[PDB]
C-alpha cells in the first residue's frame, strides 16, 4: 500500500516544482481587498494567466521524461493542457480555507468580475465539486502533471511515449488516494472523473474570454498563441 522510495522521490520532486507557482494568498488578497471594474478584472486575469502559462512551461519541462519527447508532441501537450491546468489551479485557490465570509466575498467578486452569466454556473459547479474531494496539495500537483501528460491529446504523434510518462504519476496518485482516504475507496475514480469536466472548459474557453463585459479583449502575445485568441 505505502509508497516506494522511487515514488516518494518522484512525489517530492513534483511537489517542489509545483510550489514555484504564485501563492494562492497573493491572488485572493488582491481581489478580496478592492472591488474592480470588468476592465481591471480582465487585465488582472490576463496578467495572472500569463504568469500561470510561464510557470506551467517550467513545471512541465521538469516532469520526468518530458524533455525526451518529440518537440512537436511537447507543444501539443502544453497547448492541450494549459486551459485545464489554469481552471484546476483556480479551483485549488477558490477552495483554500479563508476567514468567515471571505470565501463568500471571493465567490461574489468572481461572479460580478465581468464574465457572462452562462459560464459562471458550470465554472462554480466545477469549483464546488473539486472542493467536495478535499484534495491535498500533493493531489493537486499530481493531477496537474496527469492533465499535462495526457496521451489522448489532439495531434500527438507518439501516444505510447506520453502513456509511459503519465503511468508512474497515476500509480503515485492512486497510492496516495488509498492511503489518505481508505473511507472513500472511490476517491481516485472521482479525481480522474473531474478531468473529463476540465476538458469541456477548454472547448468553450475562447467564447468565455470574448464574452467578458469589456470594450477591448486585449491579450498578451503568449496568451494569444496558447489560447488561440487575437
Amino acid at each position: 500500500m505505502e509508497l516506494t522510495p522511487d515514488q516518494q522521490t518522484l512525489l517530492h520532486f513534483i511537489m517542489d516544482s509545483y510550489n514555484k507557482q504564485r501563492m494562492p494568498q497573493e491572488i485572493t488578497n488582491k481581489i478580496l481587498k478592492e472591488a474592480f471594474s470588468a476592465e481591471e478584472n480582465f487585465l488582472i486575469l490576463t496578467e495572472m494567466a500569463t504568469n500561470h502559462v510561464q510557470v506551467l512551461v517550467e513545471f512541465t519541462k521538469k516532469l520526468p521524461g518530458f524533455q525526451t519527447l518529440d518537440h512537436e508532441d511537447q507543444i501539443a501537450l502544453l497547448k492541450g493542457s494549459a486551459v485545464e491546468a489554469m481552471f484546476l489551479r483556480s479551483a485549488e485557490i477558490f477552495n483554500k480555507k479563508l476567514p468567515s465570509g471571505h470565501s463568500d466575498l471571493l465567490e461574489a467578486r468572481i461572479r460580478n468580475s465581468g464574465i457572462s452569466d452562462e459560464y459562471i454556473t458550470p465554472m462554480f459547479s466545477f469549483y464546488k465539486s473539486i472542493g467536495e474531494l478535499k484534495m491535498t496539495q500533493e493531489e493537486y500537483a499530481l493531477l496537474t502533471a496527469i492533465v499535462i501528460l495526457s496521451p489522448d491529446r489532439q495531434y500527438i504523434k507518439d501516444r505510447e511515449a506520453v502513456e509511459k510518462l503519465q503511468e508512474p504519476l497515476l500509480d503515485v496518485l492512486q497510492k496516495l488516494c488509498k492511503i489518505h482516504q481508505p473511507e472513500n475507496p472511490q476517491h481516485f475514480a472521482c479525481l480522474l472523473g473531474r478531468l473529463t469536466e476540465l476538458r469541456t472548459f477548454n472547448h468553450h474557453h475562447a467564447e468565455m474570454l470574448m464574452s467578458w463585459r469589456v470594450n477591448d479583449h486585449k491579450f498578451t502575445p503568449l496568451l494569444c498563441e496558447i489560447w488561440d485568441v487575437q
Binding site: V57, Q74, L78, L222, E225
Partner: peptide, 11 residues
Amino acid sequence: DHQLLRYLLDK
C-alpha cells in the same frame, strides 16, 4: 507557428 511556446520549451 507557436514560436513563443517553442522558445520557452527549448531554452
